[PDB]
Amino acid sequence: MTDRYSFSLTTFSPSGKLGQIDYALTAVKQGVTSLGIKATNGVVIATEKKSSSPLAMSETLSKVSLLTPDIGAVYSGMGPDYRVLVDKSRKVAHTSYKRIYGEYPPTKLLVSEVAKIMQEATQSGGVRPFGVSLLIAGHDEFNGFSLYQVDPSGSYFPWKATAIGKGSVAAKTFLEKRWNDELELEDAIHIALLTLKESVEGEFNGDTIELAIIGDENPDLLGYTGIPTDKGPRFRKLTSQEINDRLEAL
Amino acid sequence: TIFSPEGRLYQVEYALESISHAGTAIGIMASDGIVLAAERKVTSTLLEQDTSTEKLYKLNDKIAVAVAGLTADAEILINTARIHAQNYLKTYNEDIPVEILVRRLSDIKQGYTQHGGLRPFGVSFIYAGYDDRYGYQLYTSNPSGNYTGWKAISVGANTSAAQTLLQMDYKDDMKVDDAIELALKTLSKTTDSSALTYDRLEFATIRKGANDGEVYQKIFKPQEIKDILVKTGIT
Amino acid sequence: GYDRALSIFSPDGHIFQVEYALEAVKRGTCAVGVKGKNCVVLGCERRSTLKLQDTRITPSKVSKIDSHVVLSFSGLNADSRILIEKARVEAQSHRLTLEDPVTVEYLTRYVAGVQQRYTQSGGVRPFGVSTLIAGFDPRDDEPKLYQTEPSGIYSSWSAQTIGRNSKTVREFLEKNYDRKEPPATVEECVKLTVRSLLEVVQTGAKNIEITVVKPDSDIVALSSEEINQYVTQIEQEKQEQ
Amino acid sequence: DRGVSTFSPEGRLFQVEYSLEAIKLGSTAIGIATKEGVVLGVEKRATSPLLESDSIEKIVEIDRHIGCAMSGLTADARSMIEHARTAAVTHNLYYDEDINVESLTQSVCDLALRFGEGASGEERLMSRPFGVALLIAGHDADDGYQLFHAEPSGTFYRYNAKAIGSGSEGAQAELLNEWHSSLTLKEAELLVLKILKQVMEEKLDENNAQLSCITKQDGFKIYDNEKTAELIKELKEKEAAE
Amino acid sequence: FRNNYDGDTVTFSPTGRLFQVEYALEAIKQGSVTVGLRSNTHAVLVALKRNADELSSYQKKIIKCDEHMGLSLAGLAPDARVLSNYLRQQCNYSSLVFNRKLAVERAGHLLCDKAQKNTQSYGGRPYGVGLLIIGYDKSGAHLLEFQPSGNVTELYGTAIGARSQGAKTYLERTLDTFIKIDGNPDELIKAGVEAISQSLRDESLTVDNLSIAIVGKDTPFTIYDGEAVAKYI
Amino acid sequence: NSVFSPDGRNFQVEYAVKAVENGTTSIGIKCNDGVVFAVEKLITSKLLVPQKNVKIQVVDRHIGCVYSGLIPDGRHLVNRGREEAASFKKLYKTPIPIPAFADRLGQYVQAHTLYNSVRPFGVSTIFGGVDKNGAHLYMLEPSGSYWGYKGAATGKGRQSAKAELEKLVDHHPEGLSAREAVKQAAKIIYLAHEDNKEKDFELEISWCSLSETNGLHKFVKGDLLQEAIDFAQKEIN
Amino acid sequence: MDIILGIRVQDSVILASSKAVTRGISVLKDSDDKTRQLSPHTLMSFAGEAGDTVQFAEYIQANIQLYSIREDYELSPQAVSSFVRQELAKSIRSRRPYQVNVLIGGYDKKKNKPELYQIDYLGTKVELPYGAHGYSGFYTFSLLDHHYRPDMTTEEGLDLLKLCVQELEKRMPMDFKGVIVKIVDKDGIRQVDDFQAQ
Amino acid sequence: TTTLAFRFQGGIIVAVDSRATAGNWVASQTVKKVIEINPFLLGTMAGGAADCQFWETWLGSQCRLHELREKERISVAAASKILSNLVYQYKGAGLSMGTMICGYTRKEGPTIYYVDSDGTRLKGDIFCVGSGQTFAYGVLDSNYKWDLSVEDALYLGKRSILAAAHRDAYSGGSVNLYHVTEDGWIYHGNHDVGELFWKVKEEEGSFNNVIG
Numbered sequence A: 001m002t003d004r005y006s007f008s009l010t011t012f013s014p015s016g017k018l019g020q021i022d023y024a025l026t027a028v029k030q031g032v033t034s035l036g037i038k039a040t041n042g043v044v045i046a047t048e049k050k051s052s053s054p055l056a057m058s059e060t061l062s063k064v065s066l067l068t069p070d071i072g073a074v075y076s077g078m079g080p081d082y083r084v085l086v087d088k089s090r091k092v093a094h095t096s097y098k099r100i101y102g103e104y105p106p107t108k109l110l111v112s113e114v115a116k117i118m119q120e121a122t123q124s125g126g127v128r129p130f131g132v133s134l135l136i137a138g139h140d141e142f143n144g145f146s147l148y149q150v151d152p153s154g155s156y157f158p159w160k161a162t163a164i165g166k167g168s169v170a171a172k173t174f175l176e177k178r179w180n181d182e183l184e185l186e187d188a189i190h191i192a193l194l195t196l197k198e199s200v201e202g203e204f205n206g207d208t209i210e211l212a213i214i215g216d217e218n219p220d221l222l223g224y225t226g227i228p229t230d231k232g233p234r235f236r237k238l239t240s241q242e243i244n245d246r247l248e249a250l
Numbered sequence B: 001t002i003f004s005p006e007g008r009l010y011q012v013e014y015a016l017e018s019i020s021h022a023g024t025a026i027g028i029m030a031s032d033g034i035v036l037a038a039e040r041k042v043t044s045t046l047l048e049q050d051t052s053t054e055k056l057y058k059l060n061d062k063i064a065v066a067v068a069g070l071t072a073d074a075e076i077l078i079n080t081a082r083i084h085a086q087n088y089l090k091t092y093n094e095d096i097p098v099e100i101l102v103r104r105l106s107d108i109k110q111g112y113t114q115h116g117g118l119r120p121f122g123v124s125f126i127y128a129g130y131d132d133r134y135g136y137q138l139y140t141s142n143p144s145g146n147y148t149g150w151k152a153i154s155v156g157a158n159t160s161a162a163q164t165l166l167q168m169d170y171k172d173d174m175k176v177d178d179a180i181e182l183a184l185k186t187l188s189k190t191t192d193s194s195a196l197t198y199d200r201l202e203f204a205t206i207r208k209g210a211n212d213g214e215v216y217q218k219i220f221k222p223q224e225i226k227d228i229l230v231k232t233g234i235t
Numbered sequence C: 001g002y003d004r005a006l007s008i009f010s011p012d013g014h015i016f017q018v019e020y021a022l023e024a025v026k027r028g029t030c031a032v033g034v035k036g037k038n039c040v041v042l043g044c045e046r047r048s049t050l051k052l053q054d055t056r057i058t059p060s061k062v063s064k065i066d067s068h069v070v071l072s073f074s075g076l077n078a079d080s081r082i083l084i085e086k087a088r089v090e091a092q093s094h095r096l097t098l099e100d101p102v103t104v105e106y107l108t109r110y111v112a113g114v115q116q117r118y119t120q121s122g123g124v125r126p127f128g129v130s131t132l133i134a135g136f137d138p139r140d141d142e143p144k145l146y147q148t149e150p151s152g153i154y155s156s157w158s159a160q161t162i163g164r165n166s167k168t169v170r171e172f173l174e175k176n177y178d179r180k181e182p183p184a185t186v187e188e189c190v191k192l193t194v195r196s197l198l199e200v201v202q203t204g205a206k207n208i209e210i211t212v213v214k215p216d217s218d219i220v221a222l223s224s225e226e227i228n229q230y231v232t233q234i235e236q237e238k239q240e241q
Numbered sequence D: 001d002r003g004v005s006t007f008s009p010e011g012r013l014f015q016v017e018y019s020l021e022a023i024k025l026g027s028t029a030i031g032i033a034t035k036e037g038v039v040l041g042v043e044k045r046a047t048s049p050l051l052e053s054d055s056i057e058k059i060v061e062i063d064r065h066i067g068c069a070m071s072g073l074t075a076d077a078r079s080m081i082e083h084a085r086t087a088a089v090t091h092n093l094y095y096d097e098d099i100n101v102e103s104l105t106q107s108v109c110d111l112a113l114r115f116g117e118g119a120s121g122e123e124r125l126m127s128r129p130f131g132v133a134l135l136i137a138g139h140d141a142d143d144g145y146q147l148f149h150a151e152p153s154g155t156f157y158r159y160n161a162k163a164i165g166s167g168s169e170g171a172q173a174e175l176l177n178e179w180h181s182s183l184t185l186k187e188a189e190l191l192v193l194k195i196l197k198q199v200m201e202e203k204l205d206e207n208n209a210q211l212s213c214i215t216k217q218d219g220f221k222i223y224d225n226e227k228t229a230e231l232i233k234e235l236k237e238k239e240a241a242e
Numbered sequence E: 001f002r003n004n005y006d007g008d009t010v011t012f013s014p015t016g017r018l019f020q021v022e023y024a025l026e027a028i029k030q031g032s033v034t035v036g037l038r039s040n041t042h043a044v045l046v047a048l049k050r051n052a053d054e055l056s057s058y059q060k061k062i063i064k065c066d067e068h069m070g071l072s073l074a075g076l077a078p079d080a081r082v083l084s085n086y087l088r089q090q091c092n093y094s095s096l097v098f099n100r101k102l103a104v105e106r107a108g109h110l111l112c113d114k115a116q117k118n119t120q121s122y123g124g125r126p127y128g129v130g131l132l133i134i135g136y137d138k139s140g141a142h143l144l145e146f147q148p149s150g151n152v153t154e155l156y157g158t159a160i161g162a163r164s165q166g167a168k169t170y171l172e173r174t175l176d177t178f179i180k181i182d183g184n185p186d187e188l189i190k191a192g193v194e195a196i197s198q199s200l201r202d203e204s205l206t207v208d209n210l211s212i213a214i215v216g217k218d219t220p221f222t223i224y225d226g227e228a229v230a231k232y233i
Numbered sequence F: 001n002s003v004f005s006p007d008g009r010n011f012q013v014e015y016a017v018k019a020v021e022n023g024t025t026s027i028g029i030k031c032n033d034g035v036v037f038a039v040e041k042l043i044t045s046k047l048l049v050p051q052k053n054v055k056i057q058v059v060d061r062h063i064g065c066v067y068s069g070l071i072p073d074g075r076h077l078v079n080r081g082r083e084e085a086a087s088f089k090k091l092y093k094t095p096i097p098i099p100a101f102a103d104r105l106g107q108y109v110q111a112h113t114l115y116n117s118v119r120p121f122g123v124s125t126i127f128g129g130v131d132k133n134g135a136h137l138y139m140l141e142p143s144g145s146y147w148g149y150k151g152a153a154t155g156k157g158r159q160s161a162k163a164e165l166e167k168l169v170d171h172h173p174e175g176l177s178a179r180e181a182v183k184q185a186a187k188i189i190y191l192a193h194e195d196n197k198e199k200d201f202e203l204e205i206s207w208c209s210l211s212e213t214n215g216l217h218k219f220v221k222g223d224l225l226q227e228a229i230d231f232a233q234k235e236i237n
Numbered sequence G: 001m002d003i004i005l006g007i008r009v010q011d012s013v014i015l016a017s018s019k020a021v022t023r024g025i026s027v028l029k030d031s032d033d034k035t036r037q038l039s040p041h042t043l044m045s046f047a048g049e050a051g052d053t054v055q056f057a058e059y060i061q062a063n064i065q066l067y068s069i070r071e072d073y074e075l076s077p078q079a080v081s082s083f084v085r086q087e088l089a090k091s092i093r094s095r096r097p098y099q100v101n102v103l104i105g106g107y108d109k110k111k112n113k114p115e116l117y118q119i120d121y122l123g124t125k126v127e128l129p130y131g132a133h134g135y136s137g138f139y140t141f142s143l144l145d146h147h148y149r150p151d152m153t154t155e156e157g158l159d160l161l162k163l164c165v166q167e168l169e170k171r172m173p174m175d176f177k178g179v180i181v182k183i184v185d186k187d188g189i190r191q192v193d194d195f196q197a198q
Numbered sequence H: 001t002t003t004l005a006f007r008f009q010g011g012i013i014v015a016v017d018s019r020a021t022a023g024n025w026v027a028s029q030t031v032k033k034v035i036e037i038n039p040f041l042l043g044t045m046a047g048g049a050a051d052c053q054f055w056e057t058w059l060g061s062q063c064r065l066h067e068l069r070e071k072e073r074i075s076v077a078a079a080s081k082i083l084s085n086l087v088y089q090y091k092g093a094g095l096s097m098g099t100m101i102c103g104y105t106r107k108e109g110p111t112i113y114y115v116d117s118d119g120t121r122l123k124g125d126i127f128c129v130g131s132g133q134t135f136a137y138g139v140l141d142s143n144y145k146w147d148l149s150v151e152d153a154l155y156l157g158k159r160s161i162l163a164a165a166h167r168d169a170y171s172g173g174s175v176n177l178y179h180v181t182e183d184g185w186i187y188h189g190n191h192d193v194g195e196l197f198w199k200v201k202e203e204e205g206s207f208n209n210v211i212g
């Protein structure tokens, strides 16, 4: 019953820092590496499934999440914060967009909505910031493909390619080396896999790696035929098997 | 919110401290247009330049802001400024006079300074607008909610150094093209980077609609910034 | 939804936050008000620091509350806008309900009430502002000058000053203001106002700004050229002995 | 710093106690109750010679039969006066009679209690206690002329004579000597004027001190400067002759 | 143990103590003495009124709640007013809805529960007043003692306030005599008046000092002050 | 209160418990068809009116409550217990089962260990009664914790009372009748008074028995009380 | 039924408004000014339900005056009329809607043109060379369709108005006790104090 | 009910009848339809007794409050507008009141304001209000001159209520007379129609519709 801390828990310090936002960023550093690479005809988001137990079933925990049929997200930092951000993000895409315009939000707008949700946790009374950074990749008719990073402060930035979390500094270097503007999606998935191998401690296979693409429309994933102007999701989670095929040619 | 023994607002002071670390933003007003230039926060090769707009935002068709500080705070404020412009247009069938919009934004900032025990917004704005009462205008607003009018002004880092230079080379009878040169010269001199290159820059103007009688905002594409950077002899 | 008390009593009897609000006023640009026989004059200093300003569009320190009443202030500039807005609304509401414009005392009492209210409400701080309100009652020629402070105290003054170095200019006005003899006209009342600011300004360029209020809604600001003529004439006339 | 209504280990309310210290810093105010009226007097205390002193309202009318004098952080008293006036006028609306002085005082003291935030059991619409004490003086048909001392503690005492403010300690001992049940209204006027002159910092004249009274017949009046002056002649001549 | 454990009423000390409530109890001990006692037919309050100067009135210590009930106070007076108004309403409520006079015991329970909520709510102090409540209901004369902790006890007699321990010891000794004082209002008062005397390092209790209240079998609750107490001095 | 210590404890709740230990000793005993509640009433002074400061409380018609610690907190619980029992009866028609009632208090008490704007309750409560399927006896600590009991004690004489309680359970595994358990309750309250023997006391007993009270909660008064006092008086010496 | 006419000539806008206030079987007044000045160069006239009429007018007047002092500026006649329309638009779907019809006559100093706005209680706004509310329009619209010219002087406008008032005096079943006439141009608002027998 | 107030050379004449009705029942003949707000202010009552009585008494309180707050008597304009605005808050709830607020202040001069429960508020020199208004209006209008003496004006007032009391079934009882000056109301008494009718018939030779 009733909150006592109706004041901001993120305040400015004598030097101009916002401590809690700094400390959430330090949490993102401690988290498992995730990355995004933009190609000419798609985006790839990838991360490692770091398991709590060998007795756990890692298929039941998705780090990669569909946000709308053409937008997907991955994170580094505190898992549960991600999970609830994903719920709010899906809802907001409906309440603030689809229920109004009859179509799904373009990438930047949804990212902007997510940013707002995180911005608020930085200003409101009696809350800490979210302990995550997200990578949001998507497609829309008028903007093409995009990749955005969203930070605990509420800040977002568009990226050609980037990595967040543990090995992020080395992985970002490995991406500046490898990225160009002629990359096909298949090349990008291949680079994503290479970059992720430096980060992975243990086994590196389709069971321990999580990887999704924003590529082309998947009419077989639509669930109905008949309406010719509805072609299906561009978001697609690659299977364990699919990953392994690209590791034997890696 | 509370006062200090000195009669200062701690949180406001520290918010202003924060801003003095943000990439410098310059605004210069000329008789036939207005210049907005700002420097991006030490970037990376992999940062998408074409689909990026972190420091310059359109408010309505006749007003823009340059941002210094927390972007996420600035987006909150920009969005409400956008609504205020649309409310005024709907009420009066006239585009909002520039000052009225600036005052309103400023008043929202003042509020977080006086009640509610929330942190202030860590944002300073330079407003660049045109209306049919005062013509071209330039305003500045900081986390205190204070606002002032200018002919030339900077926010963020090195305002101290940038202000002295603008004071030196600013002359009331300038054309826009002269103000463009001044803004880029001033950024170049004050930068903590080596060369001031296109990819570290956001740039915009408000002119007299190429050839018309109407007012037009140009938010420079990256390529345009590279050209205008060779022209003024910084390559 | 936040009402945690910020302004409270001290062991020795003061309200600490109000006392500090006064410190904010102490460091605000100086403002001065002096009333003649058939007018009141308001003067304000502009800081030397920044001179690349735009004087057309920068908010000036004197504000019209209604067509016959003005307000100047010292302290936090953003704070003053909240008082001025409220005062203007109250003025229209008074004309709407009483069918008469406000008296200067009434408007002062109202502004002081808003100030006081902010010293005893949870989760708001007092206004870091002191005001000078001046004008003429409807259908009256007798000039009025009032002062408010963050505590909500208010009172009328023959002449008064607030803000930084107000101590010096008050000292100057105590010696130079004769109550039986008020300045006889606009010209000579403006001069005394400029003189008092000259004790503190030290260039007084367009740094000094003046406003003159006369009976029946006759309020005019003074341009640079007019103040110039006052400044030049004061320093020339006063040199030789 | 912890709370606004915390008890000290002695069993006293911290913030209440300090509000009383704020009253000790205020101007002096004096009330004397006779059988022919009650006299209220105050020290104006202008902070500068440029302050137009007759704009110093420290004696206010509450109703025709009730006036009051204030001492402390005098701005806090605005809403207490407003409340008091409303109570009196309201009482007359509901009951077509005059409100008893005691009842009006109690009403003002109930208002003074409403500090905090909204204490459990009922709601407090105020963040600190008032920093001002009041001397409420009036006449009703039941209990005649009365003088009450309303404290921001919400207690009120009736008094034959009372001083509040910076001069209060000395002024009270003085009253303990001078007050007798017989005093006429003219005597009481002179006593207030005498005791103010004793404790004031300027020389007392018809500008830095204000007099008022309340009589059953003429209601409550603030004496103008011309009248107090003639009583300040009259007090000079009576003391210089003793 | 004493350190950061008296901040508010919402903190337990490592000893299990609530210091805010213990401090509120100290405001009672600071208050002017008051005595209550009863037989089978009547209940009497006797209170030592206190002035704040020689020019002042003695401040009232006895409050009427209903025709069959009233209380005396010791400690913070405005708190007594808050509590008696509540009790006045509870009495009133019972009359209007049920056409029933409130049992003095129920008034005890109600006051207790009201006090309790102020020993558990953040940012609210406890009540800083002790009360003695007397009444005549459908089971006779009653006397209660109210502590700000919420504890209410039914007694034959008791005293609260400064130096009250005197009066309490006397009443403990007089028990068997005053319990029987029946159908004699004036004897019980004189017994109570003399009981309050044991608590005087003060002065001689004068005609302004003294406050007496009575209620019983055929007497509505009534307060005696000034001239009307003279005959008991 | 909403504060876990470095090792997982709640120091505020632990301190709440010290207030309970500080309190008077109260007990409950589950007989083969009901429950008996008894409590030690310290006599501070002869001025206290005997029999007239009732500590044991009824909730609905079939439940008894006794507690040790801050009495006012106990009354606060019983008030809430009553609202909670009315609410249940209103929707469901049947009077509240005792385990159902137990949890209502459980959750309410636990709630007061979740927030910094609240202090835990400074009581433990022994309560129970007869429902649709037998007799139940419960004890609920400041933390919200509660379990079913055969016998229960709390307060000053908690330790010696449990020792007596443990013995009864061992000698009588097959039942103890309501009439018997009343006697033993009186006994145990005498044998926890030994600690506070400097100050005088008064004994309160209540019971809720299917055969003896027809499943309603009743105060043990008159001849039955006197006889149980005698049994305890004779068996103390 | 309350006569409310407006005609826009070349350099001014002319408002004419009936003087009677009738409740029941009685004419309580024959000098009622059914006008409020909103700003030095904007005038508004009103007709409708008994109480809402003046209450609405004065509320708008308070608002426009507030604006002027806040901005030290006079709102264009077009902006004032938009403000008025929106207030009526919100009002029509409220709990108890303002039953007032208005004419706004303004001289726009920034364009140097006179402007006439007819707005009814529903918030139906339209700019007109000439307009009317109530039954009077059933006579005056046709007359002015005939007699009106876009280049008329203020004086010609007053003759045209006199022609309108004559028609109403002849054909309307009610006695509206003549009109009060007001002229809005560059030099502000002025009343033609003689019209009733001019 | 019939109530009137008019302005003339020497101030204001306020005159009212004193009959109360419920349907066709004469409830009372001795009712007070004038309220004396303050020494310089009067209010008249027509329509619903309670509505008038209760809200004009309240207006008195509000006026008194202004005196205390402003250290000055309330203007007639402002007093009328308080009542005007209150009544307007209640529009459509069925308040039924015909009202005149009459008085003197230095700044205004003598002033009359008509205020009804529709919210209408008008300033003027002559008003008659109530079911008898037309009857009073007939006599009043046909003998009204600005320069009537005080004595004449009081009589014309008196006579106009009589006119109305005779013809309107819901008016009657007695006439109550008031004069408002720069100094300012003075009561000019109660005049029972029981006697006044016959006296006025005799002295003036009017009322020839009446036999005997």
Ligand SMILES: Cc1ccccc1CNC(=O)[C@H](CCc1ccccc1)NC(=O)[C@@H](NC(=O)c1ccc(OCc2ccccc2)cc1)[C@@H](C)O
Binding pocket: H001, H019, H020, H021, H022, H023, H027, H031, H032, H033, H045, H046, H047, H048, H049, H050, H052, H053, H096
């Ligand atoms: C200005 C005034 C001021 C003071 C004295 C007289 C008048 C003149 N004025 C009247 O005499 C009016 C005329 C009728 C009239 C009434 C109202 C509006 C206009 C005209 N009479 C009344 O108000 C009388 N009461 C009544 O008429 C009623 C009052 C309440 C009633 O309640 C009925 C009811 C109760 C419950 C539910 C539903 C209906 C019935 C009659 C009163 C002199 O007893």
Ligand SMILES: [Mg+2]
Binding pocket: F002, F114, F115, F116, F117
């Ligand atoms: Mg908590």
Ligand SMILES: [Mg+2]
Binding pocket: F153, F154, F155, F158
């Ligand atoms: Mg135990």
